Amino acid sequence: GKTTSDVGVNLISGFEGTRFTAYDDGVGIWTIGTGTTVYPNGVKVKKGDTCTPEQAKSYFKHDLAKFEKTVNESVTVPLTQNQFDALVSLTYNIGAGALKNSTLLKLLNKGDYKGAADQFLVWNKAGKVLKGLVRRREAERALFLKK
Template sequence: MQISQAGIELIKHFEGCKLTAYKCPAGVWTIGWGTTEPIHGIRPHEGMRITQQQADTLLLDHLKSYEQAVKTSVTYPIHQNQFDALVSFTYNCGKGALKTSTLLKKLNQGDILGAAQEFLRWNKAGGQVLQGLTRRRTAEMERFLTPPEDPLYERAIDTLVEAQIITSPQIWKDRTYTQANVRDLMIKVATKM
């Protein structure tokens, strides 16, 4: 799985792009679309400048390692929107933060709603609640809880309702079931027929 264009746009929306290095609210030198990692071996620093094309390329290049961190850390089946939210979170908070987070622990235990609520705890920098981080975590949580638009799964939910395996199509919209749950239930229905 790779981050979708919508996931990239989520990151861009909250990171913003600055072509001259600056210190972020956490006091870390940053450039481009939130890049804090070295560029050709040189960390962002005062006076450093890049072009828009370099900023765009850096984002796409650096996202690969954050995608990999999510792939190796998450053991529970997730869909594209959840992956996008987790990559955005990891890009902003760091790979170590993801790996040690209660968010990840809850997700890997299958507690989707509990994991989603954990996003909101990550809204501080330097011990202070930042409104920008609160907005970002809320957007990530909402993306995480948004089922993918997939007509196959919508039809599957209808089938599960008709077979009285689940009681309402609203359950899918309420995020009680993930794609993995639906797949397992469809297998259950198919084996009964």
């Protein structure tokens, strides 16, 4: 299958940010590194955790491989590298279950690229529509549609 490109890694990194002490992501999930919330050994990120640049790099790479596998195994239609990057970013933010259950994936796997691109935009909620999620879904949709 495919792997995330430098473009997709940079998109994800830019929207996740990088921090080396654990912080609450706003919805109550403690986060560290570049958006890490679960360490590769299954341990949850908790308040007071600290990490080094190399450790954040390792956690980011592990989770990238995980969501790359999710996308490669869930999507049954051809993808450009742009679309794969966008879908990996989305799934990184929303999770594998949310992707697999989304109408986005239903439309995508019916071959309805435009419908899936537009379905990117419905994932802007904090449980509140946050603006950062709005901008992120818009940027991901734009990458997904870029040829």
